[PDB]
């Protein structure tokens, strides 16, 4: 389905895609291979959908946080640069694109948000979030505003949520989610108060913040290096500086490494490797991209040493040091989807902060909590003995849901025994190969009919039935993969329903005696 003897590249519409296209033409001049650069909308959502059918671009550019999901789903080629090429880029940039001990992409550039301020309106930018309300009252008296930034993407609000102790995954313990802790609450409450007190507008997006800053209407924005080009063109006298503190603590931006992955379905992997290693990741390659839209602190040592004298890059790295490198684990997609919704709902008043972050903590934890319950149930059903290990400090839900599933699922296996035996005989489950096939079937069976807990119990009960069979034919090793597939089916297709029901607390409530 992907065309051979050509390279299609996807990169986000805020990056230097014209610069990338020049590196494309320089690859074409020397090889006669034509490089097409596209910047589709929602490309981080559209990559997994199309790559999963063997389609999409040869090369996908995004921050590293989305690459573990892609690698887990088999969408990316392992990359195997020799040691002489590895030594040309900073090791911590390689760490960002290492997943299960394999390099799954090429690192390009280190991205961190900074505070961007109009030196003509605000010769001394605030050191603290707390002084922005008073500052805004002062600028409003002159027909200006203190601060506008994109409230539609959680990335821009995360530094403030994280300042007083909010976090995604404790360092990575995916059992420890920091989305609804007191630190997160205090950060998002301060944001909502800025909106309530009319210092910010809940509808402000990328375009509105950018235009307001570049036209000199607002004294400050929050943005990455890519934004500096449009500000150069604007003639705004701007500075790039350390983010304001919150409760005396630094803002901690989530740090992204812009990364180039190679489609597993691509029949041009050697051309892609040749383009990325010998044309893009060179002094002339990165300069071409950088001149269009700044990359930040580039992964390439030679060229990073030239750019590091720029005070805007120094400020970028200063914000990077105070932030955290994002996790690349497959949970990150769901974490971002949850926190985006929480910030938008808290900002608009659809939900309170406590409500919004409660829903976001449930969404971020949903996968791991589902798998915990389902894997424990399938294993104990297969072996006749429960798992002895602790459920966690935050897993009282997990223990109650498993108790409910045991009580309710007891009957479902017994009543549907004849029908389960038939369906199992109608499939040929014999090894890990056959378990792959089940997902399509379960999806299709879960794709029609009504969404309720009874049907979820029926699905998991068939899972346990299969786990028992797997154990009988010495395929015990296939139980965890089966449990992952049932979890994947359940979470990927019913996420929004499950968050609505308060996830597994809902399940325990619905069948309470
Ligand atoms: C992959 C097997 C799966 S996953 C699955 N997920 C939800 N519900 C299922 N079953 C009920 C239909 C049903 C009810 C009672 C008796 C028999 C069937 C439902 O869809 O509500 C199934 C089935 C399933 C299992 C065994 C026989 C089956 N016959 C059709 C589906 C199905
Ligand atoms: O808003 C969540 C979003 O944050 C990051 O995306 C950034 C990206 O890293 C930057 O390169 C820049 O383009 O802005 C984006 C935010 O709009 C994560 O990388 C992304 O996965 C996540 O969805
Ligand atoms: Na986007």
UniProtKB/Swiss-Prot annotation:
Record's subcellular location: Periplasm
One Pfam family cited in the UniProt record for this chain: SBP_bac_1
Keyword Signal attached: yes
GO terms for MF: carbohydrate transmembrane transporter activity; maltose binding
GO biological process, one term: maltodextrin transmembrane transport
Keyword annotations: Periplasm, Signal, Sugar transport, Transport
GO cellular component, one term: outer membrane-bounded periplasmic space
Kinase as UniProt keyword: no
NCBIfam families: PRK09474.1 (NF007011)
Family, per entry: Belongs to the bacterial solute-binding protein 1 family.
Quaternary structure (record): The complex is composed of two ATP-binding proteins (MalK), two transmembrane proteins (MalG and MalF) and a solute-binding protein (MalE).
Function: Part of the ABC transporter complex MalEFGK involved in maltose/maltodextrin import. Binds maltose and higher maltodextrins.
Stated name of the protein: Maltose/maltodextrin-binding periplasmic protein
Record lineage: Bacteria, Pseudomonadati, Pseudomonadota, Gammaproteobacteria, Enterobacterales
């Amino acid at each position: 389905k992907i065309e051979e003897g050509k390279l299609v590249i996807w990169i986000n519409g805020d990056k230097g895609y014209n610069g990338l296209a020049e590196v494309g033409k320089k690859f074409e001049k020397d090889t006669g291979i034509k490089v097409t650069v596209e910047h589709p909308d929602k490309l981080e959502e559209k990559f997994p959908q199309v790559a999963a059918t063997g389609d999409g671009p040869d090369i996908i550019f995004w921050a590293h946080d989305r690459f573990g999901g892609y690698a887990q789903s088999g969408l990316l080629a392992e990359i195997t640069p020799d040691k002489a090429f590895q030594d040309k880029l900073y090791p911590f940039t390689w760490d960002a694109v290492r997943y299960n001990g394999k390099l799954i992409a090429y690192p390009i550039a280190v991205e961190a948000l900074s505070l961007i301020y109009n030196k003509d309106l605000l010769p001394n930018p605030p050191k603290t979030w707390e002084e922005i309300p008073a500052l805004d009252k002062e600028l409003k008296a002159k027909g200006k505003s203190a601060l506008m930034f994109n409230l539609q993407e959680p990335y821009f609000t995360w530094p403030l949520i994280a300042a007083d102790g909010g976090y995604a995954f404790k360092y990575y313990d995916i059992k420890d989610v920091g989305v609804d802790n007191a630190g997160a609450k205090a950060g998002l409450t301060f944001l909502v108060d800025l909106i309530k007190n009319k210092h910010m507008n809940a509808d402000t997006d990328y375009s509105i913040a950018e235009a307001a800053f570049n036209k000199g209407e607002t004294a400050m924005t929050i943005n990455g290096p890519w934004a500096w080009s449009n500000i150069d063109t604007s003639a705004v006298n701007y500075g790039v500086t350390v983010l304001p503190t919150f409760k005396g603590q630094p803002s901690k931006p989530f740090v992204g490494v812009l990364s180039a992955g190679i489609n597993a379905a691509s029949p041009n992997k050697e051309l892609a490797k040749e383009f990325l290693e010998n044309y893009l990741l060179t002094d002339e390659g990165l300069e071409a991209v950088n001149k269009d839209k700044p990359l930040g602190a580039v992964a390439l040592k030679s060229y990073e040493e030239e750019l590091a004298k720029d005070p805007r890059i120094a400020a970028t790295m200063e914000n990077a040091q105070k932030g955290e490198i994002m996790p690349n684990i497959p949970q990150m997609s769901a974490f971002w989807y949850a926190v985006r919704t929480a910030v938008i709902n808290a900002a608009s008043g659809r939900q309170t902060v406590d409500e919004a972050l409660k829903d976001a903590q449930t969404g971020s934890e949903l996968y791991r909590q589902s798998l915990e319950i389902i894997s424990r149930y399938l294993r104990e059903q297969a072996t006749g003995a429960a798992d002895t290990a602790p459920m966690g400090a935050s897993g009282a839900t997990s223990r109650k849901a498993l108790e409910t599933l045991r009580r309710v699922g007891d009957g479902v296996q017994r009543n549907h025994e004849t029908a389960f035996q038939g369906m199992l005989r109608k499939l040929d489950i014999k090894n890990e190969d056959d378990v792959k096939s089940l997902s399509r079937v379960m999806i299709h069976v879960f794709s029609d009919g009504v969404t309720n807990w009874g049907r979820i119990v029926t699905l998991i009960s068939f899972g346990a039935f299969v786990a028992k069979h797997l154990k009988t034919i010495n395929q015990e090793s296939c139980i965890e993969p089966l449990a992952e597939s049932i979890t994947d089916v359940l979470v990927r297709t019913k996420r929004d329903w499950l968050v609505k029901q308060r996830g597994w607390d809902g399940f325990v409530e619905f069948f309470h005696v």
